[PDB]
Amino acid sequence: AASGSALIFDEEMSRYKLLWTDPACEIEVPERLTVSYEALRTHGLAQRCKAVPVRQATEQEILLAHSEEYLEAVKQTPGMNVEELMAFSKKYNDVYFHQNIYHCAKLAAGATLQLVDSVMKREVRNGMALVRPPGHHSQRSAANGFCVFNNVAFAALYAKKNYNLNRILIVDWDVHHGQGIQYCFEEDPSVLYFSWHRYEHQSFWPNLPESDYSSVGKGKGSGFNINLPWNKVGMTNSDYLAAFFHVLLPVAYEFDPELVIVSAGFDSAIGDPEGEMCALPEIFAHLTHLLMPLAAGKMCVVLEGGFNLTSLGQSVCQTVHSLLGDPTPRISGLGTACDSALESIQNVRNVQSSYWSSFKHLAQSVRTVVVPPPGVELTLPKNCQHSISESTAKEVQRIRDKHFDLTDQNILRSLGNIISVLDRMMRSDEVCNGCVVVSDLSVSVQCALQHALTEPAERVLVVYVGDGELPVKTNDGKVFLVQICTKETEDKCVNRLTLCLREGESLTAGFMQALLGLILPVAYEFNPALVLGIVEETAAKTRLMRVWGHMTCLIQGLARGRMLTLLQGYDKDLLELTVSALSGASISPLGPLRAPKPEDVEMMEKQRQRLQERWGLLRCTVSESW
Template sequence: SYLAKCCFPYLTSTDPACKIEVPERLTVSHETLVRTGLADRCVSVPVREATDAEILLAHSEEYLEAVKKTPYMSLEDLMEFTRQYGDVYFHPNIYHCAKLAAGAALQLVDSVMTGKVRNGMALVRPPGHHSMRSAANGFCVFNNVAIAAQYAKQKYGVQSVLYFSWHRYEHQKFWPHLRDSDYDIVGKEKGAGFNINVPWNKVGMENGDYLSVFCHVLLPVAYEFCPDLVLVCAGFDSAIGDPEGEMCATPDVFAHLTHLLMNLAGGKLCAVLEGGYNLTSLVQSVCQTVQTLLGDPVPRPASLKSPCISALESLQCVRSAHKAYWSCLKHAADLPASTISTRQIKLGEGEETTEKGEEEEKDAEEKVWPEPPKRVTPPVCAALVLPDDVACPEGCECFSFSEDLDPLLASKLRYG
């Protein structure tokens, strides 16, 4: 059997005062991977900084030049610079860390596309998925996965990009309140149909809701699209207990979602860490993802429920919006006629958007859930003929040809 190996560019830094996007997100995740033995089963890939040219694949030159100046700013100037953007925190070291985060994603793409590893996950911060071409946003400075996608197109001849996103939306009442995040924003001109938004209009979505969207939207379209590479913005703020997402996906479901994606692109999958702010569910979700990338059997789904009405409605709206672009969806039903619709609701003047108070954040943090089930690693048996001057590795048993070695097995052995 083949053991898929993963790479873990590991980054950390001293961050400014931020309640949830903290260095422990990386340190605790990495320490747990080491403690559970998962890190030892992975190939570590060295980290490098992304070059200016690589960052400019997804960002404007004006924005890059502005961020370049941040290491030399006074604290007062940094605060003023930060106020230009939404929910992001600049400090003198963030430019360096952001270059390393983007560079780690590119190292992972190189390793997977050249066959050094079959798949992998990059543990990085700052995250990247909220940053825009000319603006930082939502803890994100450079869009790591967007840069990686353009890099793959440029270096490895990938032709086109299909973008899929599910996200908390609540009829545009949840941050960042973007009309562009609704289900009917499908892309423009030649890109029509290649932008798939699944808006969650309620909190508390569970495993069945996520799996239903995979089975009825993402996977059918992805198989029709037939990608050369799968890039995953691995955000775990959809996991239970997260103070931002307020969803209820248990960590073991990420094993199933990862497993389903591994059947695409010949298994070439690059996951890059994004959100996830409850340290307990984050660490569990990361470990479930990595163990699946390593090829271990996924756990048996536990207590699956049918998708809720709101999830079904979002699913139906997305399928209807994309039926003109994908043959696998051509028989999808039309938009629901119910009065409760995922259609964007224009906020009235002075109407409040969804904001969380301290008590709500506390409630999200205090949710409890069972530990993910223990996953058994299948035994890996291998035999190898060693030169006479090489000692038998620890944990292996040495045989000689005089000990009645199976002739068929002996004929398959090779020198290392």
């Protein structure tokens, strides 16, 4: 039962710097480290995190990913003067050395191990390490690209040996390719390495053909190395989210990592002189959030790059915000990925399709308000509450007279409860989300949505779980309706998405692929002000409630996390699961998910072809030119 978020940091790692004029290395300054921590303090985030002390990495730990020949060469640098430090730096590609850099490199390595021990010993839920020098360019016998030792490589090897881990996911969202990490795990199918990076047809540093999408791994580890090259600059939020939805996330949940490590470099953020991208710092609150259902939340974030001092702290804060569980900012303006990004996304999916079958194509502190039935007390997490007002009961009496004949007082209580929690979610912002146990489905749902439009909730997303007619139409304001059922139907409207999954053992896999590839792209582009989750009696405790905790966790990326959930009937297990995932707890893994049955893959692709014209964030192929 892990608790909070670790923040490993030490100011000693800022006590090395460039000592000669060297235009390639001028951007790597100690101020990157002090600005990232000071920004965490100004916004009160550091004080909220469990500080963990920085230790040195033992030379046996360093030899996990490096050779004695190179370690002993670095170990001799603290005795060098400046002229000897230049002579040693010139032996390597874009990296300087300092009398103190060997010391700090051992701290950056040990700090990463400290973070691994913290998360793996269930001492913390997750954590971030603010280390310097970076890691992912460092190779077995050479320093490269400001890196001395591969901090992320150690963590994965350290977590393998000392915790007997079989499946580790490494996500490298730094704008540069982490060839050091690729080389280290090239033939290793236990460490899935994903990296997007500014490539520009190999014209951008490090200018390696192995950085291209062709490198899917060697030997038994082929298919466990995924490169996504950005071939043009100016990539935006829609590009990064299309990369997650249609490349990284489908592979990650099938892989089911036992631990997620992140090469977090924020030179992929707007304003950075090296990445020249256009993604806002808020995007990293979502990249983080979309990964947290993996590995029961066990997530280690290690600082890599990020060179614009202003935009850097903003991106660090968004990551720690999400790491602590704060509501994710609403991302607006999302649409289709540019044609270059779609080109790379389409190529990676095809080259990886021989290893991941879902990529194949056909030939051409109050957070949650819990409102259960009367006289049933329950055990609720620390940040959970309970229930009515007269202005509410008056308004419910107004609603009851004008639109309903409604007599039962038990469902008059729920209508007053639904309104009360909705007003606290929007107008007053006290709570984020809530759950209400409901008897009458059609009235509760139709009253909830109609009251939400007056809050005002501009656009509402409605996720319905069950068969039969929906209690809400496509007309009630700006709404997008999503139904998960088993009754085969073919919808016509562009704001409706009906997913008829084929019941059985593979209901778990088809759901997740439909969530990451269809539901989440549309919802993120829709940008709802409120999410309305519904589940009827017929679908409760049944086979598709395995993914429900995952959906209600991932869907909180929309609408600042404001999600009202209406449970029909009463299931103790179900209400337990929704409230936990609404409250921010960790989600139990689903195990290694096989590929869904091709009968569901086809229905999903028919839905994608139907909506990707209107909702361009569904596209994972270049647009056919007209």
